[PDB]
Amino acid sequence: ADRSKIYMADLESALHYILRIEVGRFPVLEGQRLVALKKFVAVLAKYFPGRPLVQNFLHSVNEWLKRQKRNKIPYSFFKTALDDRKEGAVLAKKVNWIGCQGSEPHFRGFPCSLWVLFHFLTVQAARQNVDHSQEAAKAKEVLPAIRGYVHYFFGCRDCASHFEQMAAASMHRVGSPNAAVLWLWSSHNRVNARLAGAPSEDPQFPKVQWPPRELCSACHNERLDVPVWDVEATLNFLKAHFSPSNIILDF
Numbered sequence: 001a002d003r004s005k006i007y008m009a010d011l012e013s014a015l016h017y018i019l020r021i022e023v024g025r026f027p028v029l030e031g032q033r034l035v036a037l038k039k040f041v042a043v044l045a046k047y048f049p050g051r052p053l054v055q056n057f058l059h060s061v062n063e064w065l066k067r068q069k070r071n072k073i074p075y076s077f078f079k080t081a082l083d084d085r086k087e088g089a090v091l092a093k094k095v096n097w098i099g100c101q102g103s104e105p106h107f108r109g110f111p112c113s114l115w116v117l118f119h120f121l122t123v124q125a126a127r128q129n130v131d132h133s134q135e136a137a138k139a140k141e142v143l144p145a146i147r148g149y150v151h152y153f154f155g156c157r158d159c160a161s162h163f164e165q166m167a168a169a170s171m172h173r174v175g176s177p178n179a180a181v182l183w184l185w186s187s188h189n190r191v192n193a194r195l196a197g198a199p200s201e202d203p204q205f206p207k208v209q210w211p212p213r214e215l216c217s218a219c220h221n222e223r224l225d226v227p228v229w230d231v232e233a234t235l236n237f238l239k240a241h242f243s244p245s246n247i248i249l250d251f
C-alpha cells in the first residue's frame with residue numbers, strides 16, 4: 001500500500017467493523033452508550049467521505065436511529081435495520097485492510113482504520129464551510145462524538161483509557177474545527193510516542209512522530225528554539241492528506 005494514500009477499503013471496513021462487531025458487543029443499546037451511538041452515527045452520515053451508496057446507507061441508518069423513541073434498542077432490533085438497508089451490498093461482508101494491513105493478523109487492522117476514520121471526520125468538518133451557526137454546531141460535535149464512541153464502544157479498553165486520559169486533560173480547550181484537527185493529530189502522536197519500540201508494535205510498521213519528513217518534509221521546523229512542528233504546514237498537509245481527492249477508490 002501507499003503511506004501517503006488512503007484506501008476506501010480501509011474506511012469502509014471501519015464502518016462495517018464498527019456497525020457489526022463493535023456496536024454488537026452490547027446486547028442492549030441504552031442510556032449514554034445509546035446517546036453516543038446516535039451522535040457518532042449522525043457525524044458519520046454528515047462527514048464520512050462516502051461514495052453515493054455509502055452516504056445513502058449512513059443517512060438511512062441515521063434516520064432510523066432518530067425515529068427510535070425507545071430509550072433502549074436491543075442489538076437484535078438494530079441488526080435488522082442494517083440488514084434492511086443492506087449494509088452488506090453497500091459496504092462488504094468481510095473486513096478489507098489495505099493501508100492498514102499488519103505484518104501479522106494481530107497487528108494494525110481495525111485500530112489503524114479507526115484512527116484514519118477519526119482523522120478524516122475531523123478534517124472533513126474543517127474543510128466544509130462552517131460560517132453558518134447551524135452547521136458550525138454540527139462541526140463542533142465531531143471530537144466529542146469521537147470521544148463518546150471510544151469510551152462506549154472501542155474494543156481495547158487499554159486503548160480507550162489512554163485516549164480518555166488525553167481527552168479529559170485538554171480536549172476542553174479545542175475551540176474550532178482546525179483546532180480539533182490539530183488536537184486529534186497531536187494526541188495520536190502522543191500515543192505514537194508511548195507505543196514506539198514497544199513489544200506490541202508491528203515490526204514492519206514502526207511508530208514515528210507522524211507525518212515523517214519522507215512523507216512531509218515541509219511539516220517540521222529546523223531551528224531547535226521554536227516549536228518542533230510548523231503547525232500551519234502540518235494543518236495544510238492534513239487537509240490535503242485526509243481529503244476525498246487523496247482517497248484511492250476501491251474499484
Ligand SMILES: Cc1cc2nc3c(=O)[nH]c(=O)nc-3n(C[C@H](O)[C@H](O)[C@H](O)COP(=O)(O)OP(=O)(O)OC[C@H]3O[C@@H](n4cnc5c(N)ncnc54)[C@H](O)[C@@H]3O)c2cc1C
Binds near residue numbers: 184200
Ligand atoms: C483512541 C485510541 C487509543 C489507542 N490506545 C492504545 C494504547 O493505549 N495501547 C496500545 O497498544 N494500542 C493503542 N491503540 C492502538 C494504536 O494507536 C494503533 O492503532 C496500532 O498500534 C496500530 O498502529 P499502526 O502503526 O498501524 O498505525 P496507527 O497509529 O493505527 O495509525 C494509522 C495510520 O494513521 C496515520 N497516522 C499516524 N500518526 C498519525 C497522527 N498523529 N495523525 C494523523 N494520522 C496519523 C498513518 O498513516 C498510519 O499508518 C489505540 C487506538 C485508538 C484509535
